[PDB]
Amino acid sequence: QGLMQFTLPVRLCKEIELFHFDIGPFENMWPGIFVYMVHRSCGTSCFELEKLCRFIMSVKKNYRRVPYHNWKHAVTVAHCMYAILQNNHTLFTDLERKGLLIACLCHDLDHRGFSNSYLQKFDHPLAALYSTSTMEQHHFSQTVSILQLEGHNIFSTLSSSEYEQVLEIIRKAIIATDLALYFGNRKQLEEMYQTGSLNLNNQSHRDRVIGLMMTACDLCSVTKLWPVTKLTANDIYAEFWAEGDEMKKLGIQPIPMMDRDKKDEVPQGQLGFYNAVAIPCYTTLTQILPPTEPLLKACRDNLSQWEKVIRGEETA
Ligand SMILES: CNC(=O)c1c(NC(=O)c2nc(C3CC3)ccc2Nc2cncnc2)cnn1CCOC
Ligand SMILES: [Mg+2]
Ligand SMILES: [Zn+2]
Numbered sequence: 669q670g671l672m673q674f675t676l677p678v679r680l681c682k683e684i685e686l687f688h689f690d691i692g693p694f695e696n697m698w699p700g701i702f703v704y705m706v707h708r709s710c711g712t713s714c715f716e717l718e719k720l721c722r723f724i725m726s727v728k729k730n731y732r733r734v735p736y737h738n739w740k741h742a743v744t745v746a747h748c749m750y751a752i753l754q755n756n757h758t759l760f761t762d763l764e765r766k767g768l769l770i771a772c773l774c775h776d777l778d779h780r781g782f783s784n785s786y787l788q789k790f791d792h793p794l795a796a797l798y799s800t801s802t803m804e805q806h807h808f809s810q811t812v813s814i815l816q817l818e819g820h821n822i823f824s825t826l827s828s829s830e831y832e833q834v835l836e837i838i839r840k841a842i843i844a845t846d847l848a849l850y851f852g853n854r855k856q857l858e859e860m861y862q863t864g865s866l867n868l869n870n871q872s873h874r875d876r877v878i879g880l881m882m883t884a885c886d887l888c889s890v891t892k893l894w895p896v897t898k899l900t901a902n903d904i905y906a907e908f909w910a911e912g913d914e915m916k917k918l919g920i921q922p923i924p925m926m927d928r929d930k931k932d933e934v935p936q937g938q939l940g941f942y943n944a945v946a947i948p949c950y951t952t953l954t955q956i957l958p959p960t961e962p963l964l965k966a967c968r969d970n971l972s973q974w975e976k977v978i979r980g981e982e983t984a
Contacts, residue, residue, distance in 0.1 A: 670712050674704040687751045687888075687962040690896045691743050698743040699724045702773060705750040709757075710765040715822045723822045726814045730777050735906035737779035741889075746772035748888035748963075752881055755959035759868060767834040768878065770811075770822070771841035772885055777810035779803065781907040782914065784848070789918055801846040808842045837878070844879030845886045847945070853879045854952050861955050877956055884953045884963060890946045891966040894973045898984055905934060935977040935984065942971040 676684060683689050684701070691701055702724060706714060731739040749772045753760060760768075784802045787795045798805035812835070815821055823831050844853065857876050860866040867873050884891075889900040905928075912926030924930050925937055950964035976982035 672717070673712065674700060674707050676701070676704055684747070685751070685754065687748065687960070688892050688896075688966050689747060689751070690892055691740065691747055695739065698739065699728070702743055702746055702769070705747060706769055709750050709753045709769065710762075714762075714766055716824070719819060719822045719824065723814065723820045724773070726817060726820060727773055727777060730810055730814065732778065732780055734779060734781040735910075736900070736903040737776045737781055737907065742773050742776055745775060745885045745888065748772075748885040748891070749881065752885070752957065752960055756957050759957070763830060763834045763837060764878070766823075767837040768841060768881070771838040771882070774811040774814070774838070775804075775807055775842045775845050775882065775886065777807045777814070779807070782911050784846070786911050786914060789915065789920055801843050801849065804843050804846045807845075808839050811838060811842065840875050841878055841882050844882040847883070849879070850883045850945075850949065854883070854948060857956065858952050861952070866956070880949070880953050880956070883949050884960070887946055887949060888963065890942065890970055891950070891963045892970075893966075894970060897970045897973070901934070901938065901984075905931075935974050938974045939971070939978060942967065942974065947971065 675681070680692075680701070684705070691698055699721065703717070703720060706720065727742070728739050731742060746769050749768050753765060753768065782790075782803075784795075784800075784804075786792075787802050792802075794802050794806050815823070815835075823834055826834060843849065853876055857866065857880055860873065860876070866877075868877065889904075890897055892900065905925075908926040909928035909931075912922035912928060915922035915926060921927075924933070925941075930937075946967050947964075950960070950967045953960050954964045973982060977984050
């Protein structure tokens with residue numbers, strides 16, 4: 669009952685509070701870690717533990733054995749959201765605490781390792797069904813499916829209209845992880861913040877901020893200790909290159925990040941990605957949520973590490 673608290677070994681208990689925490693190589697431990705994060709950020713009364721565990725294991729089952737967009741990534745993204753929530757606890761509603769961890773867990777459901785562009789060029793049926801944010805609408809669709817399985821409705825105690833709000837929080841959160849949308853969203857939040865217009869009681873403003881939190885959480889692999897960030901970059905390029913292979917099989921030249929014949933220009937590509945995407949992302953998020961500072965700091969640190977790789981002072 670509410671007398672049963674989830675607990676972590678001492679190192680995990682302490683370090684899970686750090687933005688740069690790595691959830692480790694033991695898959696069996698990740699459901700325990702997520703439940704722990706839900707109990708401490710939401711509460712032990714937020715979800716029926718039996719439903720949550722059933723919902724978690726179905727979500728895990730619907731993640732694929734791909735190098736990067738996998739179950740480890742879902743929990744990692746949830747953990748980053750947990751860290752943002754714990755250090756900005758005053759700024760979020762009950763529905764947002766409930767819904768955002770779950771959105772992070774579900775945000776890449778049934779990812780096969782291929783971008784929205786590959787599905788468009790392949791003419792995947794999902795591209796007829798969802799003309800933009802294709803994968804992201806599929807991720808949400810899969811979330812809803814899993815909620816509608818017997819014994820899986822973790823939101824069963826909520827009123828009809830709360831359930832609808834929480835699903836709309838989840839839907840918009842998952843859609844926000846379409847990076848094609850992030851550039852617009854970050855520009856808008858940037859202008860809004862500088863002008864002083866930004867207003868966390870304005871729902872459409874809340875939506876934008878949660879969307880940037882999701883971008884930041886989604887990319888949070890660039891905010892880990894260097895060994896984690898460097899090893900995780902191998903996994904994403906494994907997917908990028910498999911997709912470039914598939915682009916080439918369609919007789920289409922892939923963009924450079926997905927061409928494995930450009931493996932030697934990964935440090936250059938990363939430098940490009942941090943300056944254009946990551947740094948601006950965590951910068952804007954740090955302005956809006958000052959206590960998310962360590963994400964930006966660890967991002968600048970890993971940039972300086974890539975610079976070191978370029979100049980031959982570091983290996984990868
Ligand atoms: C839009 N750009 C690019 O998506 C892009 C790159 N994307 C990533 O590296 C990357 N993308 C995602 C999301 C977009 C798919 C997440 C993590 C990434 N990296 C990473 C590094 N370390 C550890 N885990 C992950 C690389 N080159 N470009 C082109 C150059 O862009 C400026
Ligand atoms: Mg995704
Ligand atoms: Zn993701």
